[PDB]
Design a protein around this ligand. Sequence first.
Ligand code: UMP
Ligand code: TEO
Length: 247
Amino acid sequence: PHIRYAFQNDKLLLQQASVGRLTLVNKTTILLRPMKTTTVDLGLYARPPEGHGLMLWGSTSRPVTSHVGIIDPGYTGELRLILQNQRRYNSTLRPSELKIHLAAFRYATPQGPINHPQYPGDVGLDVSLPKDLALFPHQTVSVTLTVPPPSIPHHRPTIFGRSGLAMQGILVKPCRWRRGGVDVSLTNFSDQTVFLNKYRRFCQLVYLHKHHLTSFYSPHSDAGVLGPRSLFRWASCTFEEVPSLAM
Ligand SMILES: O=c1ccn([C@H]2C[C@H](O)[C@@H](COP(=O)(O)O)O2)c(=O)[nH]1
Ligand SMILES: O=C([O-])[C@H](O)C=C([O-])O
């Protein structure tokens, strides 16, 4: 399969597009104010092959957390990375300290608490909050989902955040939804208490094909997505530059 893309941004360098993953790195210093969202407009456009979505994620050893972005197959706008400052003062990413990754995966879609996809073809299904929560500034809050989602053979249910909460300072730490049930953690990086009532959509349910979860560290895998216990392994695709995709 081919991923077709276009990229144009003088503040970012394309490091490589190899073994199914594109990596960009920052050429300029990136300033992060405390308590506020930082967005990086990537100048990057892409369309996945049939049956696949795309995954967007950032990686750094500085004290900065990035949203893990689930990219729908019908999306034809510009991709953005959303970052949050872990400290209570300015943090900077000096040239080359931020890596930005994009790669594809096969997924499946079933037919409260679980809602149908927003648009034809969307990868994720919104999951509703089972109780009111109060999220205080610079604090983490955890919630349990225990009632099983729909079973889909050869796929693995996983939870990821949505981009609109992320823009408000609320990140979800992505995690597998395992047989026992899943503890979903939300951190508020903003300066204000955020109230999320019962029935609010707070995260999304994604069914990755099981090939996309591994324990081996590979050319084809990375600990940066779901963390260390289950590595994300992206599809073996080829990137192909189609400059007219750029808007
Ligand atoms: O980190 C992200 C996450 C999402 N999106 C784009 C592609 C998605 O299809 C669309 C909506 O994503 P959600 O609101 O559903 O997370 O925005 C990004 O550009 N960057
Ligand atoms: O909001 C989205 O999920 C995305 O924007 C969907 C399409 O198809 O364009």
